[PDB]
Enzyme design. Structure first.
Site, PDB file in Angstrom:
ATOM      1  N   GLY A  29     -27.790   6.671  -9.042  1.00  0.00           N
ATOM      2  CA  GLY A  29     -26.860   7.637  -9.688  1.00  0.00           C
ATOM      3  C   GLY A  29     -25.523   7.356  -9.619  1.00  0.00           C
ATOM      4  CB  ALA A  32     -21.000  12.976 -11.252  1.00  0.00           C
ATOM      5  CB  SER A  33     -20.362  14.656  -6.524  1.00  0.00           C
ATOM      6  OG  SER A  33     -20.516  14.695  -5.181  1.00  0.00           O
ATOM      7  N   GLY A  34     -20.538  11.482  -6.778  1.00  0.00           N
ATOM      8  CA  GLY A  34     -20.345  10.104  -6.213  1.00  0.00           C
ATOM      9  C   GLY A  34     -21.391   9.153  -6.418  1.00  0.00           C
ATOM     10  CG  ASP A 141     -27.135  25.723  -8.368  1.00  0.00           C
ATOM     11  OD1 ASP A 141     -27.509  26.527  -9.578  1.00  0.00           O
ATOM     12  OD2 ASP A 141     -26.626  24.654  -8.655  1.00  0.00           O
TER      13      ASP A 141
END
EC number: 2.7.11.1
Length: 293
Positions: A29, A32-34, A141
């Site tokens: 992936g 984004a975040s990482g 969430d």
């Protein structure tokens, strides 16, 4: 402040570089975040998921510190547990358990779960919720994207990037951190919510499992919260196709009165869960969803 952030993470991390302990790095992936990888703990041969984060570009670092601290102190079979972490300069690695069977979202979008398979998923998520709630942690969430599945039908909660640790002194929160379509109505209608927001969120996820989507998926996220807030308990397209005990369970999760809404501990007793199929019954749905991507 960036200095104290780095020092705090340094106290938390294992020393050195992760490539000393993990070998079979394969990107899966992109952030984004990482950048997310898979790899193997060479000592044990456990397959793992590793998040690589550049901290200078990460907006909210207090949240990764919180994420790791909460997870480290809250390991559970129905949670994708935190394993290890490394800080190399400004580069943080967070090592996680890896589940090869994708998210519940893929299952709900590609396959059609029967009630016995839904009862199994609800039970596992509720086991995780109960454990969290008794440790004063609200996930905040809960949604199908946040449930990861093992190839063996294992069910695990993930993404603790939005979780709250409450206290007997501040047992309620106000921050709107959840995904709109899964949010409890009280998150928008009041400024005090507790652990039972995850129960509401679990109910909308059971709706996903029935209908393939949460209510209002196709609305603007801003208009969804107004609809949740003004319609209350969402209506099912075809309630008559569900067993009575399933409908009852749903009514208990999506109850508008927070006090009336079941807690995780109470819902684990619900007869709907007693029709649960063996977790292995999920494996053909996992396989079909994976194939379909």
């Amino acid at each position: 402040s960036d200095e104290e952030i780095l020092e705090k993470l340094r106290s938390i991390v294992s020393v050195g570089d992760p490539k000393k302990k993990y070998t079979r790095f394969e990107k899966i992936g992109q952030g984004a975040s990482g950048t997310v990888y898979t790899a193997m703990d060479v000592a044990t041969g456990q397959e793992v998921a590793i998040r690589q984060m550049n901290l200078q570009q990460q907006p909210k670092k207090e949240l990764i510190i919180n994420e790791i601290l909460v997870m480290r102190e809250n390991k559970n079979p129905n949670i994708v547990n935190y394993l290890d972490s490394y800080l190399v300069g400004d580069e943080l690695w967070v090592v996680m358990e890896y589940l090869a069977g994708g998210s519940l979202t893929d299952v709900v979008t590609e396959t059609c779960m029967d009630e016995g398979q839904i009862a199994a998923v609800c039970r596992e998520c509720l086991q995780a919720l109960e454990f969290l709630h008794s440790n004063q942690v609200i996930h905040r969430d809960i949604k199908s994207d946040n449930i990861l599945l093992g190839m063996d039908g294992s069910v695990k909660l993930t993404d603790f990037g939005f979780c709250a640790q409450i206290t007997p002194e501040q047992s309620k929160r106000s921050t709107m951190v959840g995904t709109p379509y899964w949010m409890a109505p009280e998150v928008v209608t009041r400024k005090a919510y507790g652990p039972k927001v995850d129960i509401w969120s679990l109910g909308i996820m059971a709706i996903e499992m029935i209908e393939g989507e949460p209510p209002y998926l196709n609305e603007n996220p801003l208009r969804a919260l107004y609809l949740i807030a003004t319609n209350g308990t969402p209506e099912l397209q075809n309630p008559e196709k569900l067993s009575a005990i399933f409908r009852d369970f749903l009514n208990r999760c999506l109850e508008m009165d927070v006090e009336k809404r079941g807690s995780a501990k109470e819902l684990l007793q619900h007869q709907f869960l007693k029709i649960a199929k063996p977790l292995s019954s999920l494996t053909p749905l996992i396989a079909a969803a994976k194939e379909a991507t």
